[PDB]
C-alpha cells in the first residue's frame, strides 16, 4: 500500500482512467472535487508545510475520461544535478527542450507538470521542468538551488531560478 510515491507516479500513465489511477496510487491517498475540481490529487510523505504529491488531470468529468495531465512535487529526484547560475544564464527563451537540457545538464531536471490540452494530439503540449544544482533538490523540505523552465510545443517560453550558485 503506502502513500503516493515516485514509483506509483511513474507507473501511472497518460491515457489512464480515473479508476486505473486510483488503483495504482491507493485510493486512501487520493481526493477529488472541492479544491481540485475533477482532477485526482494524491498525497505522499509530509514535506514542508504540505506533502509531496501527484495531481492527475483528465480530458473530462466522464468516467471514461483519460489522464491528459501529470503533475508532481517531491516524488522524484534529479539523476545527476549539475545546474549552476552560469548555466542558467546560458538558457534562452526560444530554445528547444533538447537545447535547454544540454545547457543546464542532462540529469539536472525533473518534470513538474506535463499537459496535453488536445490529447491524444501533442499540439499545444505544455511542460514545466524543475532543474537543480548539485545540492538543490529536497524531497522533504525546501530547494536550495532550483530553476523553473517552462515550454509549449517543446520550445522554452520562460525561465526563473532560486538560490543558484
Amino acid at each position: 500500500a503506502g502513500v503516493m510515491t515516485g514509483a506509483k507516479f511513474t507507473q501511472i500513465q497518460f491515457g489512464m482512467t480515473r479508476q486505473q489511477v486510483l488503483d495504482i496510487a491507493g485510493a486512501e491517498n487520493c481526493e477529488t472535487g472541492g479544491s481540485f475540481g475533477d482532477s485526482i490529487h494524491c498525497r505522499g510523505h509530509a514535506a514542508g508545510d504540505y506533502y509531496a504529491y501527484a495531481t492527475f488531470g483528465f480530458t473530462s468529468a466522464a468516467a471514461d475520461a483519460k489522464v491528459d495531465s501529470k503533475s508532481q512535487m517531491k516524488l522524484l529526484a534529479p539523476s545527476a544535478p549539475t545546474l549552476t547560475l552560469a548555466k542558467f544564464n546560458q538558457v534562452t527563451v526560444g530554445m528547444t527542450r533538447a537545447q535547454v537540457l544540454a545547457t543546464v545538464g542532462q540529469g539536472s531536471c525533473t518534470t513538474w507538470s506535463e499537459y496535453y490540452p488536445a490529447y491524444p494530439s501533442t499540439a499545444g503540449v505544455t511542460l514545466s521542468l524543475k532543474c537543480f544544482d548539485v545540492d538543490g533538490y529536497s524531497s522533504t523540505g525546501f530547494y536550495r538551488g532550483m530553476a523553473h523552465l517552462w515550454f509549449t510545443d517543446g520550445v522554452l517560453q520562460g525561465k526563473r531560478q532560486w538560490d543558484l550558485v
Partner: protein
Amino acid sequence: SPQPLEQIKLSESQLSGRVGMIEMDLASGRTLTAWRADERFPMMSTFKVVLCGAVLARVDAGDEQLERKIHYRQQDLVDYSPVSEKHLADGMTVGELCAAAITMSDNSAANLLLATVGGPAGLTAFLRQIGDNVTRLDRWETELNEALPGDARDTTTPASMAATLRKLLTSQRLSARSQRQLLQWMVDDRVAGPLIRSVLPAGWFIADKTGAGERGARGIVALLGPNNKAERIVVIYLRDTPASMAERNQQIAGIGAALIEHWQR
C-alpha cells in the same frame, strides 16, 4: 504536563532552538503566558491570515469581491502550490485563493493575493494601519521562508502576532461577515494535524494556521477553547534548530499539550 514554561525550556534544551510563545485571552486581550514574546521569528505561511485579513478589509470597503476571478500564468507558479497550479488554465476567485493560501499553505495563491493589496509593502502598510508597528512582510513566496539568522525580513513577534490576530478576528475592524469568513478558513486548515490538533481534547474548538521554513523554522497561530468555543489565542514559533521535522512538530505539540493540561492552572 510539565507547566507550559517548563515544557518550553525542555523543548529549547532538546532542540537547541529558540521558542516564542504567547497565550492570550481572546475576549480581553490580556496576556496569560509569554516566552520570548518580543523576539522576532519568521512568519512563514502564518502571514497568510494577515494577508487574507487585508483582502477582506478591501471587500468590506467595496474595493474587492471574493467572487472576482484572477487569471495567471506559468511565471506566477512557485514551489508548494498544489491548488493554484491545478487551476492555471481556468483561474481562481479571490475567495478560492484565500482558501488555498490558508488551508493548504498554497504559495502562488498567496503571491496572487499579495499583488491585490500592494505587495509585501502594501501588506506591511495595512499592519501599520491596524496598529501593528512590529510585524513586517518584505519578500514574496518562496523567499520569505528563508529564515536566515538575525534577518528581520518577514518576521513578527509572538506578542505582535497575537494582538494582530485578535484585532483581525474580533475588533470589528473587519465586518462580522469577514470575521466569520477568516475564522472559517482557519477552522478548515488541512495541514495542521501534527501540531495542536494532535493534542486537542475531544469537544474543543480550534482554528489555526501553520508555517514551515528553512533552518528549522516552524510555527502555528491558533484560536482554541473548550465546549467548542474559542477562548484563547495561542502563538508558537520555533527558529534556529537543526532538528528533524518530526522532532519539531512533536515539541510544538507538546507545548500545546502543556497549555491544555494547565488550562485553568
